[PDB]
Amino acid sequence: LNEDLRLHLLLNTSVTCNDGSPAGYYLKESRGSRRWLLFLEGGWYCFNRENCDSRYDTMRRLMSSRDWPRTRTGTGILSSQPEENPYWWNANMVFIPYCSSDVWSGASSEYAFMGALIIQEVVRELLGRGLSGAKVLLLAGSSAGGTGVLLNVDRVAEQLEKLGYPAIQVRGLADSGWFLDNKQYRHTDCVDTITCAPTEAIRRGIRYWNGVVPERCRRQFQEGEEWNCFFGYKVYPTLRSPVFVVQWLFDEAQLTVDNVHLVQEGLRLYIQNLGRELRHTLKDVPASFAPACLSHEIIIRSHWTDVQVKGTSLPRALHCWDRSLHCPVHLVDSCPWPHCNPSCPT
Ligand SMILES: O=C(O)C1=C[C@H](O)[C@@H](OS(=O)(=O)O)[C@H](O[C@H]2[C@H](O)[C@@H](NS(=O)(=O)O)[C@@H](O)O[C@@H]2COS(=O)(=O)O)O1
Numbered sequence: 001l002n003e004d005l006r007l008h009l010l011l012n013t014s015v016t017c018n019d020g021s022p023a024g025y026y027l028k029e030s031r032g033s034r035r036w037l038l039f040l041e042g043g044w045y046c047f048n049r050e051n052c053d054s055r056y057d058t059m060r061r062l063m064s065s066r067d068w069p070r071t072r073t074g075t076g077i078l079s080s081q082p083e084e085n086p087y088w089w090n091a092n093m094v095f096i097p098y099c100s101s102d103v104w105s106g107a108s109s110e111y112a113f114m115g116a117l118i119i120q121e122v123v124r125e126l127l128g129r130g131l132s133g134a135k136v137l138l139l140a141g142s143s144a145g146g147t148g149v150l151l152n153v154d155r156v157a158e159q160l161e162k163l164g165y166p167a168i169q170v171r172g173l174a175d176s177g178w179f180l181d182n183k184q185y186r187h188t189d190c191v192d193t194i195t196c197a198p199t200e201a202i203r204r205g206i207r208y209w210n211g212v213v214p215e216r217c218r219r220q221f222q223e224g225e226e227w228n229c230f231f232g233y234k235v236y237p238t239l240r241s242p243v244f245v246v247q248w249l250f251d252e253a254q255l256t257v258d259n260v261h262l263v264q265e266g267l268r269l270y271i272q273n274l275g276r277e278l279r280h281t282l283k284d285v286p287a288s289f290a291p292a293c294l295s296h297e298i299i300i301r302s303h304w305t306d307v308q309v310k311g312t313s314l315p316r317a318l319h320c321w322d323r324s325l326h327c328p329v330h331l332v333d334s335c336p337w338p339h340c341n342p343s344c345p346t
């Protein structure tokens with residue numbers, strides 16, 4: 001079937017997944033479009049050797065390209081089906097698998113952590129396949145990929161300028177990558193990946209990965225405090241590129257790193273207060289879609305068309321935003337408990 005995205009393993013074999021196998025990207029071109037959607041996959045991270053070894057046994061797909069299929073079907077925002085992707089179905093579609101376990105921050109050649117270099121390489125190869133004629137490059141991503149967008153969107157804009165392609169408009173779409181460096185509901189020592197407090201996880205990770213953060217955010221904090229720049233509300237104010245933020249107010253990954261296990265009155269208040277704090281961080285982000293749901297990720301799920309805030313679908317909010325850069329803003333739920341929005345996914 002001609003709508004499948006096809007796998008290209010990177011020609012520069014020194015840019016690799018964790019285990020040294022080549023990184024790569026899936027692509028399907030669309031002749032009648034100047035719009036490029038480049039999606040960064042997510043799936044947590046690993047911040048020390050012991051935890052990376054465990055991940056390599058249990059989730060090898062996220063550390064290696066050995067078994068990646070030669071094709072994949074685009075879903076959600078990467079779908080070519082009009083009913084599934086009403087405005088952008090005809091776009092040039094790219095899926096970049098996540099095999100670096102570094103929130104796309106690794107910038108140096110044990111395990112290799114090369115996420116930032118993988119993005120740089122994919123952009124380089126795409127230029128020869130038609131990216132050089134693009135009007136819009138939307139760097140999109142879910143979960144660790146959504147954080148990856150915040151970390152890389154301005155680096156891609158600068159890359160394209162440097163290479164001599166200044167007319168391409170680089171923009172970002174961060175889905176489920178806007179986290180709070182908050183106090184846990186119940187303290188736990190940083191041992192396992194999924195329950196390690198967000199502040200400590202990144203403090204450890206950035207050193208282990210030799211990770212890099214955006215230049216504009218790095219200069220705001222003291223040398224050694226670059227971990228700050230992994231948190232959306234800290235990185236966002238200094239971005240040069242336009243970025244649309246999609247974020248469930250009660251994100252399941254946030255609740256997990258906060259050591260919440262799912263209700264007593266103390267936990268109800270903790271969870272309610274999370275939604276409030278998140279809402280506060282989005283107060284001055286007009287390009288936002290933030291429903292009051294307990295969920296995680298949305299933009300490559302087939303049902304992304306069905307979620308609404310203030311009578312507006314997510315595809316429509318994105319179309320409205322695109323058009324405003326060439327129908328409403330700050331689509332953040334006012335209702336204050338998880339799943340108060342009738343369109344929340346099951
Ligand atoms: O509408 C299209 O996307 C499209 C229309 C053409 O019928 C077809 O060209 S061809 O019949 O002359 O080959 C065009 O082919 C693309 C092909 O889909 C691409 N495959 S991909 O890399 O997996 O996306 C690629 O091979 O480029 C072909 C040429 O496209 S062009 O550069 O726009 O002419 O698809």
Ligand SMILES: *[C@@H]1O[C@H](CO)[C@@H](O)[C@H](O)[C@H]1NC(C)=O
Nearest residue numbers: 012013014015108109114117
């Ligand atoms: C290939 O990738 C490696 C690792 O990032 C880099 O050192 C090397 O210079 C790259 N080759 C190029 C850009 O030709």
